[PDB]
Coordinates of C-alpha atoms in Angstrom, one line a residue:
Chain A
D240 CA 0.0 0.0 0.0
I241 CA 2.8 2.4 0.9
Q242 CA 5.8 2.3 -1.5
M243 CA 9.1 4.2 -1.3
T244 CA 11.2 4.4 -4.5
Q245 CA 14.8 5.4 -4.5
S246 CA 16.5 6.8 -7.6
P247 CA 19.0 6.1 -9.0
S248 CA 19.4 2.4 -8.2
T249 CA 23.1 2.7 -8.8
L250 CA 25.6 5.5 -8.6
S251 CA 29.2 5.7 -10.0
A252 CA 31.5 8.4 -8.7
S253 CA 35.1 9.2 -7.7
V254 CA 36.6 10.4 -4.4
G255 CA 35.9 14.2 -4.1
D256 CA 32.7 14.1 -6.2
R257 CA 29.2 15.1 -5.1
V258 CA 26.3 12.7 -5.5
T259 CA 22.6 12.9 -4.8
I260 CA 20.1 10.1 -3.9
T261 CA 16.4 10.8 -4.4
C262 CA 13.8 9.1 -2.2
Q263 CA 10.1 9.3 -3.2
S264 CA 7.2 8.1 -1.1
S265 CA 3.6 7.4 -2.2
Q266 CA 2.4 8.7 1.1
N267 CA 3.4 11.8 3.2
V268 CA 5.8 10.8 6.0
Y269 CA 4.6 11.4 9.5
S270 CA 4.6 15.2 10.3
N271 CA 6.1 15.6 6.8
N272 CA 9.6 15.0 8.2
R273 CA 10.0 11.4 9.4
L274 CA 12.5 10.2 6.8
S275 CA 15.8 8.6 7.7
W276 CA 18.9 7.6 5.7
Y277 CA 21.0 4.5 6.3
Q278 CA 24.4 3.3 5.1
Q279 CA 25.2 -0.4 4.7
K280 CA 28.4 -2.2 3.6
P281 CA 28.4 -5.9 2.7
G282 CA 28.4 -8.2 5.7
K283 CA 27.6 -5.5 8.1
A284 CA 24.5 -4.1 9.8
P285 CA 23.0 -0.8 8.6
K286 CA 24.3 2.4 10.0
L287 CA 22.1 5.4 10.7
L288 CA 23.2 8.5 8.9
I289 CA 20.3 11.0 9.1
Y290 CA 17.0 11.2 10.8
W291 CA 14.1 13.8 10.8
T292 CA 15.2 14.5 7.1
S293 CA 18.3 16.4 8.0
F294 CA 19.7 15.6 11.5
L295 CA 23.0 13.9 11.4
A296 CA 23.5 11.0 13.9
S297 CA 26.5 11.2 16.3
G298 CA 29.8 11.0 14.5
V299 CA 28.3 11.4 11.0
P300 CA 30.5 13.7 8.9
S301 CA 29.0 17.1 7.8
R302 CA 29.5 16.1 4.2
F303 CA 26.3 14.2 4.5
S304 CA 23.2 16.4 4.1
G305 CA 19.5 15.6 3.8
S306 CA 16.6 17.7 2.6
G307 CA 13.0 17.4 1.5
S308 CA 9.5 17.3 2.9
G309 CA 6.3 15.4 2.4
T310 CA 6.8 12.8 -0.3
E311 CA 10.1 13.8 -1.9
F312 CA 13.5 13.7 -0.1
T313 CA 17.2 13.9 -1.1
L314 CA 20.4 12.7 0.4
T315 CA 23.5 14.6 -0.7
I316 CA 27.1 13.5 -0.2
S317 CA 29.6 16.3 -0.9
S318 CA 33.2 15.4 -1.6
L319 CA 33.0 11.6 -1.5
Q320 CA 35.5 9.8 0.7
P321 CA 36.6 6.1 0.2
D322 CA 34.5 5.2 3.3
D323 CA 31.4 6.5 1.6
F324 CA 31.1 3.7 -1.0
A325 CA 28.2 1.5 0.2
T326 CA 24.5 0.9 -0.3
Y327 CA 22.1 3.6 1.0
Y328 CA 18.5 3.1 2.2
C329 CA 15.9 5.7 3.0
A330 CA 13.3 4.8 5.6
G331 CA 9.9 6.5 6.2
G332 CA 7.7 6.7 9.3
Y333 CA 3.9 7.2 8.7
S334 CA 0.7 7.8 10.7
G335 CA -0.6 4.7 12.4
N336 CA 2.9 3.4 13.2
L337 CA 3.8 2.3 9.7
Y338 CA 7.2 2.0 8.2
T339 CA 8.9 1.1 4.9
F340 CA 12.4 1.1 3.4
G341 CA 13.5 2.1 0.0
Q342 CA 14.9 -0.5 -2.3
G343 CA 18.5 0.9 -1.9
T344 CA 21.0 2.8 -3.9
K345 CA 24.5 1.3 -4.6
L346 CA 27.3 3.9 -4.7
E347 CA 30.3 2.3 -6.5
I348 CA 33.7 3.5 -7.5
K349 CA 34.0 5.1 -10.9
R350 CA 37.0 4.1 -13.0
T351 CA 38.0 3.8 -16.7
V352 CA 36.4 1.3 -19.1
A353 CA 38.0 -2.1 -19.1
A354 CA 36.9 -4.8 -21.4
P355 CA 36.3 -8.3 -19.9
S356 CA 38.4 -11.4 -20.7
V357 CA 35.9 -14.0 -21.8
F358 CA 36.4 -17.7 -21.1
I359 CA 34.0 -20.7 -21.7
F360 CA 34.2 -24.0 -19.8
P361 CA 32.5 -27.2 -21.1
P362 CA 31.1 -29.5 -18.5
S363 CA 33.7 -31.9 -17.1
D364 CA 33.5 -35.7 -17.7
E365 CA 33.1 -36.3 -14.0
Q366 CA 30.0 -34.1 -13.9
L367 CA 28.6 -35.8 -17.1
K368 CA 28.9 -39.1 -15.3
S369 CA 26.8 -37.6 -12.5
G370 CA 23.9 -36.9 -14.9
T371 CA 23.9 -33.2 -15.5
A372 CA 25.9 -30.7 -17.6
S373 CA 26.9 -27.2 -16.5
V374 CA 28.6 -24.8 -18.9
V375 CA 30.4 -21.9 -17.4
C376 CA 31.3 -18.5 -19.0
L377 CA 33.7 -16.2 -17.2
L378 CA 33.9 -12.4 -17.5
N379 CA 37.1 -11.4 -15.7
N380 CA 38.0 -7.9 -14.5
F381 CA 35.8 -5.6 -16.4
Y382 CA 34.2 -2.1 -15.9
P383 CA 31.5 -0.8 -16.0
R384 CA 29.3 -3.4 -14.4
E385 CA 26.8 -3.4 -17.3
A386 CA 27.4 -6.3 -19.6
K387 CA 25.2 -8.6 -21.8
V388 CA 25.9 -12.3 -21.7
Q389 CA 23.8 -14.5 -24.1
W390 CA 24.0 -18.3 -24.5
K391 CA 23.6 -19.8 -28.0
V392 CA 23.2 -23.5 -28.4
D393 CA 23.4 -24.5 -32.1
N394 CA 23.1 -20.7 -32.8
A395 CA 19.8 -20.7 -31.0
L396 CA 19.3 -18.2 -28.2
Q397 CA 18.8 -19.5 -24.7
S398 CA 16.6 -18.2 -22.0
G399 CA 15.4 -19.3 -18.6
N400 CA 18.2 -21.9 -18.2
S401 CA 21.1 -19.8 -17.0
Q402 CA 22.0 -18.0 -13.8
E403 CA 24.9 -15.6 -13.3
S404 CA 26.8 -14.3 -10.3
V405 CA 28.8 -11.1 -9.9
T406 CA 31.6 -10.3 -7.5
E407 CA 31.9 -7.2 -5.4
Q408 CA 33.9 -4.4 -6.9
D409 CA 37.6 -5.3 -6.6
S410 CA 39.6 -3.6 -3.9
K411 CA 42.6 -3.0 -6.1
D412 CA 41.4 -2.4 -9.7
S413 CA 37.7 -1.5 -9.0
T414 CA 36.6 -4.0 -11.7
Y415 CA 33.8 -6.6 -11.7
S416 CA 33.9 -10.3 -12.5
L417 CA 31.0 -12.4 -13.6
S418 CA 30.3 -16.1 -14.2
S419 CA 27.3 -17.3 -16.2
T420 CA 26.3 -20.9 -15.8
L421 CA 24.2 -22.7 -18.4
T422 CA 22.4 -25.7 -16.7
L423 CA 21.0 -28.5 -18.9
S424 CA 20.1 -32.1 -18.5
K425 CA 22.7 -34.6 -19.7
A426 CA 20.3 -35.8 -22.4
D427 CA 19.6 -32.3 -23.8
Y428 CA 23.3 -31.4 -23.6
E429 CA 24.2 -34.3 -25.9
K430 CA 21.4 -33.3 -28.3
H431 CA 23.4 -30.3 -29.6
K432 CA 26.9 -29.6 -30.8
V433 CA 27.9 -25.9 -30.6
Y434 CA 27.8 -24.1 -27.3
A435 CA 28.7 -20.4 -27.5
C436 CA 28.9 -17.6 -25.0
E437 CA 28.5 -14.1 -26.5
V438 CA 29.4 -11.0 -24.5
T439 CA 28.6 -7.4 -25.2
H440 CA 30.4 -4.7 -23.3
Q441 CA 31.4 -1.0 -23.7
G442 CA 35.1 -2.0 -23.7
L443 CA 34.4 -4.3 -26.7
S444 CA 34.0 -2.7 -30.2
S445 CA 32.2 -5.9 -31.3
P446 CA 30.6 -8.8 -29.4
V447 CA 33.1 -11.5 -28.3
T448 CA 32.1 -15.1 -28.8
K449 CA 33.7 -18.1 -27.0
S450 CA 32.4 -21.5 -28.1
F451 CA 33.2 -25.3 -28.2
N452 CA 31.8 -28.4 -29.9
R453 CA 30.5 -31.7 -28.5
Chain B
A158 CA 22.0 14.7 24.6
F159 CA 24.0 11.6 25.3
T160 CA 21.9 11.0 28.4
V161 CA 18.6 12.6 29.2
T162 CA 17.6 12.7 32.9
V163 CA 14.3 13.5 34.6
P164 CA 14.0 15.2 38.0
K165 CA 11.1 12.8 38.8
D166 CA 10.0 9.4 37.5
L167 CA 6.5 10.1 39.0
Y168 CA 4.6 13.4 39.2
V169 CA 1.6 13.6 41.5
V170 CA -0.5 16.6 40.6
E171 CA -3.9 17.8 41.7
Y172 CA -7.0 18.1 39.4
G173 CA -7.3 21.4 37.6
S174 CA -3.8 22.5 38.5
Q175 CA -0.9 23.4 36.2
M176 CA 1.7 20.7 35.6
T177 CA 5.3 21.0 34.6
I178 CA 7.3 17.9 33.7
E179 CA 10.9 18.1 32.7
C180 CA 13.6 16.3 30.8
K181 CA 17.2 17.5 31.4
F182 CA 19.9 17.2 28.7
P183 CA 23.5 18.4 28.6
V184 CA 24.3 21.8 27.3
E185 CA 28.0 22.5 27.6
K186 CA 28.7 26.0 26.3
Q187 CA 25.6 27.6 24.8
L188 CA 22.4 26.4 23.2
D189 CA 22.4 26.0 19.4
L190 CA 18.7 25.9 18.6
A191 CA 19.5 24.6 15.1
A192 CA 20.3 21.1 16.1
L193 CA 17.8 20.7 19.0
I194 CA 14.8 18.4 18.8
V195 CA 12.3 18.2 21.7
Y196 CA 9.4 15.7 21.4
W197 CA 6.7 15.0 24.0
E198 CA 4.1 12.2 23.7
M199 CA 1.6 10.3 25.8
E200 CA -0.1 7.0 24.8
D201 CA 0.5 7.4 21.1
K202 CA -0.8 11.0 21.4
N203 CA 1.7 13.7 20.3
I204 CA 1.7 16.6 22.8
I205 CA 4.3 19.0 21.3
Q206 CA 7.2 19.1 18.9
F207 CA 10.1 21.6 18.9
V208 CA 12.4 21.6 15.9
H209 CA 14.3 24.4 14.0
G210 CA 13.7 26.7 17.0
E211 CA 9.9 26.6 16.7
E212 CA 7.0 24.6 18.1
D213 CA 5.5 22.1 15.6
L214 CA 1.9 21.3 16.3
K215 CA 1.0 19.7 13.0
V216 CA 0.4 16.2 14.6
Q217 CA -0.6 17.5 18.1
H218 CA -3.5 15.6 19.6
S219 CA -6.6 17.6 19.9
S220 CA -6.7 17.2 23.7
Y221 CA -3.6 19.4 24.1
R222 CA -4.6 22.2 21.8
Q223 CA -4.2 25.5 23.8
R224 CA -3.3 23.5 26.9
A225 CA 0.3 22.3 26.2
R226 CA 3.4 24.5 25.7
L227 CA 7.2 24.2 26.0
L228 CA 9.0 26.6 28.2
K229 CA 11.5 27.9 25.6
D230 CA 13.5 30.0 28.1
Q231 CA 14.4 26.8 30.0
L232 CA 15.9 25.2 26.9
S233 CA 19.1 27.4 27.2
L234 CA 19.7 25.8 30.6
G235 CA 19.3 22.2 29.3
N236 CA 15.7 21.9 30.6
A237 CA 12.9 20.7 28.3
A238 CA 9.9 21.6 30.5
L239 CA 6.5 20.6 29.2
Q240 CA 3.8 22.8 30.7
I241 CA 0.2 21.5 30.7
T242 CA -2.6 23.7 32.0
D243 CA -6.0 22.7 33.4
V244 CA -4.9 19.1 34.3
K245 CA -7.8 16.7 34.1
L246 CA -8.1 13.0 35.1
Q247 CA -7.4 12.0 31.5
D248 CA -3.9 13.5 31.8
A249 CA -2.7 10.7 34.2
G250 CA -0.7 8.1 32.4
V251 CA 2.7 7.4 30.9
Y252 CA 4.6 10.3 29.2
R253 CA 7.8 10.2 27.2
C254 CA 10.2 12.8 26.1
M255 CA 12.8 12.6 23.2
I256 CA 15.7 15.1 23.2
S257 CA 18.1 15.3 20.3
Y258 CA 21.1 17.7 20.8
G259 CA 24.1 16.1 19.2
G260 CA 23.0 12.8 20.6
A261 CA 19.5 11.5 21.3
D262 CA 17.8 9.8 24.2
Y263 CA 14.3 8.9 25.6
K264 CA 12.9 9.1 29.1
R265 CA 9.7 7.9 30.6
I266 CA 7.7 10.0 33.1
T267 CA 4.5 8.8 34.9
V268 CA 1.8 11.3 35.9
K269 CA -0.9 10.6 38.6
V270 CA -3.8 13.0 38.9
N271 CA -5.6 13.2 42.3
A272 CA -9.3 13.4 42.5
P273 CA -10.8 17.0 42.5
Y274 CA -11.9 16.7 46.1
Chain C
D150 CA 28.4 0.4 26.9
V151 CA 25.1 -0.2 25.0
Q152 CA 24.9 -3.7 23.4
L153 CA 22.5 -5.5 21.1
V154 CA 22.7 -9.3 20.5
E155 CA 20.4 -11.4 18.4
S156 CA 20.1 -15.2 18.9
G157 CA 18.0 -18.1 17.9
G158 CA 18.6 -18.3 14.2
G159 CA 19.0 -21.6 12.5
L160 CA 17.6 -24.1 10.0
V161 CA 13.8 -24.5 9.8
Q162 CA 11.7 -26.6 7.5
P163 CA 8.9 -24.8 5.6
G164 CA 5.8 -24.4 7.8
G165 CA 7.9 -24.6 10.9
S166 CA 8.3 -22.1 13.8
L167 CA 11.2 -20.3 15.3
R168 CA 11.7 -17.7 18.1
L169 CA 14.4 -15.1 18.0
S170 CA 15.8 -13.3 21.0
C171 CA 17.2 -9.8 21.2
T172 CA 19.1 -9.3 24.5
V173 CA 19.8 -5.7 25.3
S174 CA 22.4 -4.0 27.6
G175 CA 22.1 -0.4 28.7
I176 CA 18.7 0.2 27.1
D177 CA 15.6 1.1 29.2
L178 CA 13.0 -1.1 27.6
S179 CA 10.3 1.0 29.4
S180 CA 11.7 4.1 27.6
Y181 CA 12.7 2.7 24.2
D182 CA 11.0 1.2 21.2
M183 CA 12.6 -1.9 19.7
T184 CA 12.4 -2.8 16.0
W185 CA 12.9 -6.1 14.0
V186 CA 14.3 -5.8 10.5
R187 CA 15.3 -8.6 8.1
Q188 CA 17.3 -8.8 4.9
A189 CA 17.0 -11.6 2.4
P190 CA 20.3 -12.7 0.7
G191 CA 21.1 -10.1 -1.9
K192 CA 18.0 -8.0 -1.2
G193 CA 17.3 -4.8 0.7
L194 CA 16.1 -4.0 4.2
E195 CA 12.5 -4.9 5.1
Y196 CA 10.7 -3.7 8.2
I197 CA 9.0 -6.5 10.2
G198 CA 7.6 -4.8 13.2
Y199 CA 8.4 -3.1 16.5
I200 CA 7.3 -3.1 20.1
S201 CA 6.9 0.3 21.8
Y202 CA 8.1 1.5 25.2
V203 CA 4.5 0.7 26.5
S204 CA 4.7 -2.8 25.0
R205 CA 2.3 -2.1 22.1
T206 CA 3.2 -4.0 19.0
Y207 CA 2.9 -3.1 15.3
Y208 CA 3.6 -5.3 12.3
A209 CA 4.3 -5.1 8.6
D210 CA 1.6 -6.5 6.3
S211 CA 4.0 -9.2 5.1
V212 CA 4.1 -11.0 8.5
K213 CA 0.7 -10.2 9.8
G214 CA -0.9 -13.3 11.4
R215 CA 2.5 -15.2 11.4
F216 CA 5.0 -13.2 13.5
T217 CA 4.5 -11.9 17.0
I218 CA 6.8 -9.6 19.0
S219 CA 7.0 -9.6 22.8
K220 CA 9.2 -8.3 25.6
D221 CA 10.5 -9.6 28.9
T222 CA 11.9 -6.6 30.8
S223 CA 13.2 -8.8 33.7
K224 CA 15.5 -10.6 31.2
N225 CA 16.5 -7.6 29.0
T226 CA 15.1 -9.5 25.9
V227 CA 12.8 -8.7 23.0
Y228 CA 11.4 -11.7 21.2
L229 CA 10.3 -12.4 17.6
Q230 CA 8.1 -15.5 17.4
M231 CA 7.9 -16.6 13.8
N232 CA 5.2 -19.1 12.7
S233 CA 4.3 -20.7 9.4
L234 CA 7.8 -19.9 8.0
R235 CA 8.2 -19.9 4.2
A236 CA 11.3 -20.1 2.1
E237 CA 11.0 -16.4 1.4
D238 CA 11.5 -15.8 5.1
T239 CA 15.2 -16.8 4.7
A240 CA 17.1 -13.7 5.8
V241 CA 19.4 -12.2 8.4
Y242 CA 17.3 -10.8 11.2
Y243 CA 18.3 -7.6 13.0
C244 CA 16.9 -6.0 16.1
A245 CA 17.4 -2.3 16.3
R246 CA 17.1 0.2 19.1
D247 CA 14.2 2.7 18.6
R248 CA 12.0 2.8 15.4
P249 CA 13.1 2.9 11.8
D250 CA 12.6 6.7 11.8
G251 CA 13.9 7.2 15.3
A252 CA 16.6 9.6 16.5
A253 CA 18.3 6.8 18.4
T254 CA 18.2 3.9 15.9
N255 CA 22.0 4.2 15.4
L256 CA 22.6 0.9 17.3
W257 CA 21.9 -2.4 15.6
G258 CA 22.7 -6.0 16.4
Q259 CA 25.0 -8.1 14.3
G260 CA 22.0 -10.1 13.0
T261 CA 21.1 -13.8 13.2
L262 CA 20.6 -16.0 10.1
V263 CA 17.3 -17.8 9.6
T264 CA 17.2 -20.4 6.8
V265 CA 13.8 -21.9 5.7
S266 CA 14.3 -24.9 3.4
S267 CA 13.3 -28.5 2.8
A268 CA 16.9 -29.3 1.7
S269 CA 19.1 -31.6 3.8
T270 CA 22.7 -31.2 4.6
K271 CA 24.9 -32.3 1.7
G272 CA 28.6 -31.8 0.8
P273 CA 29.3 -30.3 -2.6
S274 CA 30.5 -32.1 -5.7
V275 CA 33.7 -30.4 -7.0
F276 CA 34.2 -30.4 -10.7
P277 CA 37.2 -28.9 -12.7
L278 CA 37.0 -25.9 -15.1
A279 CA 40.0 -27.0 -17.1
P280 CA 42.3 -24.3 -18.5
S281 CA 42.3 -24.1 -22.3
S282 CA 45.6 -24.5 -24.1
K283 CA 44.7 -23.0 -27.5
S284 CA 45.5 -20.1 -29.8
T285 CA 43.3 -17.2 -28.6
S286 CA 44.7 -17.4 -25.0
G287 CA 42.9 -14.1 -24.0
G288 CA 45.9 -12.5 -22.3
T289 CA 46.2 -15.1 -19.6
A290 CA 44.7 -18.6 -18.7
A291 CA 41.6 -19.1 -16.7
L292 CA 40.8 -22.2 -14.6
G293 CA 38.6 -23.0 -11.7
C294 CA 36.4 -25.3 -9.8
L295 CA 32.6 -25.8 -9.9
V296 CA 31.3 -26.2 -6.3
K297 CA 27.9 -27.9 -7.0
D298 CA 24.8 -29.0 -5.1
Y299 CA 25.6 -28.3 -1.5
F300 CA 23.5 -27.2 1.5
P301 CA 23.8 -25.2 3.8
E302 CA 25.9 -22.1 3.2
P303 CA 29.3 -21.6 4.3
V304 CA 31.6 -22.9 1.7
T305 CA 35.3 -21.8 1.8
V306 CA 37.5 -22.1 -1.3
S307 CA 41.2 -21.6 -1.4
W308 CA 43.8 -22.3 -4.0
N309 CA 47.1 -24.1 -3.3
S310 CA 46.4 -24.0 0.5
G311 CA 46.2 -20.2 0.4
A312 CA 49.6 -19.8 -1.4
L313 CA 47.7 -18.7 -4.6
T314 CA 45.5 -15.5 -4.0
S315 CA 46.2 -13.1 -6.8
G316 CA 43.6 -13.3 -9.6
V317 CA 41.3 -15.5 -7.6
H318 CA 37.6 -14.8 -7.9
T319 CA 35.2 -16.9 -5.8
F320 CA 31.6 -16.0 -6.8
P321 CA 28.6 -15.7 -4.5
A322 CA 26.6 -18.9 -4.4
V323 CA 23.3 -19.3 -6.4
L324 CA 20.3 -21.0 -4.8
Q325 CA 19.2 -23.6 -7.4
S326 CA 15.5 -24.6 -7.8
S327 CA 16.3 -27.9 -6.2
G328 CA 17.1 -26.0 -3.0
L329 CA 20.8 -26.7 -3.2
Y330 CA 23.6 -24.1 -3.6
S331 CA 26.3 -23.9 -6.3
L332 CA 29.1 -21.6 -7.2
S333 CA 32.3 -21.3 -9.2
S334 CA 35.8 -20.2 -8.0
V335 CA 38.2 -19.2 -10.8
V336 CA 41.7 -17.8 -11.0
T337 CA 43.6 -16.3 -13.9
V338 CA 47.2 -17.5 -14.2
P339 CA 50.1 -16.9 -16.6
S340 CA 49.7 -19.0 -19.7
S341 CA 53.2 -20.4 -19.6
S342 CA 52.6 -21.9 -16.1
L343 CA 49.8 -24.3 -17.1
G344 CA 52.2 -27.1 -17.8
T345 CA 54.7 -26.2 -15.0
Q346 CA 52.5 -25.2 -12.1
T347 CA 50.0 -27.5 -10.3
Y348 CA 46.7 -25.8 -9.4
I349 CA 44.5 -27.3 -6.7
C350 CA 41.3 -25.8 -5.3
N351 CA 40.6 -26.5 -1.6
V352 CA 36.8 -26.6 -1.0
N353 CA 35.7 -26.8 2.6
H354 CA 32.1 -27.3 3.6
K355 CA 31.9 -27.2 7.4
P356 CA 28.2 -28.3 7.9
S357 CA 29.0 -31.6 6.1
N358 CA 32.5 -31.8 7.6
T359 CA 33.9 -32.2 4.0
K360 CA 37.2 -31.2 2.6
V361 CA 37.9 -31.7 -1.1
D362 CA 41.2 -31.0 -2.9
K363 CA 40.5 -31.0 -6.6
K364 CA 43.4 -30.7 -9.0
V365 CA 42.7 -28.8 -12.2
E366 CA 44.9 -30.0 -15.1
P367 CA 45.1 -28.5 -18.6
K368 CA 43.4 -30.3 -21.5
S369 CA 45.5 -30.8 -24.7

């Protein structure tokens, strides 16, 4: 019934930049000012940054600033510091003791474009003896995060039979890595010959295809 | 406001009298009204709000209209004093204050109202 | 100083019940609200409910009729009784001082993990991702291990007993429709070292007390 939408869902910036996160609520927050901002890093509990739309919690640096009223609110981080890269959540309080959280905004480290290294792995013979076939496609050390990975089996596009996983931004080169796994039955795997992984990325002038037979 | 204190956990007041309940908070050098938040409530009913140097009565319960006020002169001394006039039997119950001044804290105060006579 | 500690998380079958505890230190439960917040793996924060300083309880619509929050002041504990648990309830559960919009909600617990699943404990099958020895090397050589069909979730992967760390990427696990987890751990190595260097992935799954050392050899 009450929805709170954060925009943008992801932010890319450098140390010293200024970023702005927008929080929109379908319903007026209580007394028009009960909006809070939270910071969360992976593996850790959320940290309260701002409450009552603009009041910094104890120890929060002054570079964090909140503003807004009613149904539109904004968090501003001026002169980003390395500690500021995290996921940010707004939270609203409403009449009748109701609460909701925004979906979260990821603030990542901006860097230069780096094309991924693409590798494809056929299922091992040990796994084929098990009774299933998993085909792995690796995208190593690329930036930005946005990338398109498509599975072609006998040059037929695949859908609904693959899942992919992405690492956190690397602490040294600030690049991402991605593995896409194509899962098929052993019978269906042996029904086809060509298994190709096709990758589209900004660092690539043309799509890169890695493939094998059998 | 790392730690808010109360002079009394229980106030015993007479019917029809004027009641002043207080929540003390640390003010080291001088009061900066910009960062101060004072919030009084009782049984989900908002009594008064003080933010940005002004009283905020947008969500004040209708029972306390023209009856509740915050002694602003006392804020400079670290005293958030809630003044309620024409105390009636419905004013007995559990009150709570929230003070935000650097830090934030909550304190519970119980009010008992004696019979008129 | 002030302390928040959750407890009671664990493995529950679907339709089961579990009670979480939030033991507080230095918090006047007669003066403070206490809130429960959960976070599913890879998702955002979700408010569950809170109990006020006068012991009144409020709940999010997603747990109405299933979760109940209570308080035992004499034991410094706030409880979350969860009934009719579904697989979607799998999450880290936090108890937080004050309300989600409160001025004093700066203190959170470390969280306790609740897992709702019909799956049984099972060690993973480790399969090699053999490095390719072919023309388009791609700058370096990539090899890895497929950690497949295990439950529950710690799995720790190392390469060459921790002596090989550069270029290692262990991916977050994916929950398969069978209810079992699976992931891949890969490492990029110099192409010339494929024939010279031996690469072994050390998969360790504590819940099944399993330790597998799978050697990845080139195919050519």
